[PDB]
Amino acid sequence: SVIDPSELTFVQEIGSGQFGLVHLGYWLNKDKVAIKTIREGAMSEEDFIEEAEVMMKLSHPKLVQLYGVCLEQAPICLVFEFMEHGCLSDYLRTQRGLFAAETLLGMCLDVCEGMAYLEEACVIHRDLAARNCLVGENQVIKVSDFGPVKWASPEVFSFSRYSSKSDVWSFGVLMWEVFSEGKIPYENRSNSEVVEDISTGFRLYKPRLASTHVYQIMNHCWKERPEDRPAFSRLLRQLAEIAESG
Numbered sequence: 001s002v003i004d005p006s007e008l009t010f011v012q013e014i015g016s017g018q019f020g021l022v023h024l025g026y027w028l029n030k031d032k033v034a035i036k037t038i039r040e041g042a043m044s045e046e047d048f049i050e051e052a053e054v055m056m057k058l059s060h061p062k063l064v065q066l067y068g069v070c071l072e073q074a075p076i077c078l079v080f081e082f083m084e085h086g087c088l089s090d091y092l093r094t095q096r097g098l099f100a101a102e103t104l105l106g107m108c109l110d111v112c113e114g115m116a117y118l119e120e121a122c123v124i125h126r127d128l129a130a131r132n133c134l135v136g137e138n139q140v141i142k143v144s145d146f147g148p149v150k151w152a153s154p155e156v157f158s159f160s161r162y163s164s165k166s167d168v169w170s171f172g173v174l175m176w177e178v179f180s181e182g183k184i185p186y187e188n189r190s191n192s193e194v195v196e197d198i199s200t201g202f203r204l205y206k207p208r209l210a211s212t213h214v215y216q217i218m219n220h221c222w223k224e225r226p227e228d229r230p231a232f233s234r235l236l237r238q239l240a241e242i243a244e245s246g
């Protein structure tokens with residue numbers, strides 16, 4: 001669907017990413033929206049439209065939804081549904097010390113449900129992190145930006161070979177982000193240092209709020225070889241097993 005600039009009311013500025021500015025607005029003085037205006041030079045306008053085109057044909061309750069595309073006036077923008085609490089990364093940083101391990105695991109499950117859908121759809125995310133996840137009504141997590149050495153798997157570090165298994169490693173890191181309440185993976189480590197530690201066999205430490213079982217799954221996502229990593233469909237059942245038990 002096509003949206004006119006006159007149909008949008010820019011209320012306030014709510015974020016600035018590498019690819020553009022995000023605003024809180026209204027469409028047709030009705031629906032509360034998030035307007036993603038393009039950043040010139042950061043990416044081609046064609047790729048900005050294609051990103052949204054792909055997303056509009058992927059329907060899952062745990063993936064962000066668009067209202068449409070506003071192309072008439074530059075800066076060109078994407079009109080998404082509003083996610084009240086914003087990015088998971090920011091929502092974890094503030095609200096830190098208030099989360100329970102039952103809530104945090106439920107967030108991983110929300111993302112895994114979404115990721116298992118994209119996996120079946122043969123769609124590779126390539127940048128799955130807490131910053132690319134959005135918190136909405138009743139703390140539901142939705143995946144966004146489905147059109148970063150700290151989230152990269154060894155195949156990505158040295159050979160740039162992305163797969164659903166590359167996203168599995170990323171999800172393992174996203175899990176650490178979630179159970180660390182927004183903390184940065186490999187805190188004061190350089191890109192060269194992250195590659196060296198992982199290549200030697202080292203991995204992110206067990207976060208305080210995570211159980212031994214949670215870390216067991218994290219380490220299953222962090223297997224050097226991608227064939228020894230579970231698919232998101234297997235991963236989803238693994239997390240649910242601990243969700244109902246203890």
Ligand SMILES: N#Cc1cccc(Cn2cc(NC(=O)c3[nH]nc4ccccc34)cn2)c1
Nearest residue numbers: 014015022034080081082083084085086144
């Ligand atoms: N009401 C309100 C309100 C006013 C100011 C800030 C906030 C918190 N906040 C919410 C967001 N939401 C988003 O950024 C957001 N929502 N859907 C999105 C889709 C794509 C990218 C970003 C999106 C960001 N900050 C909420």
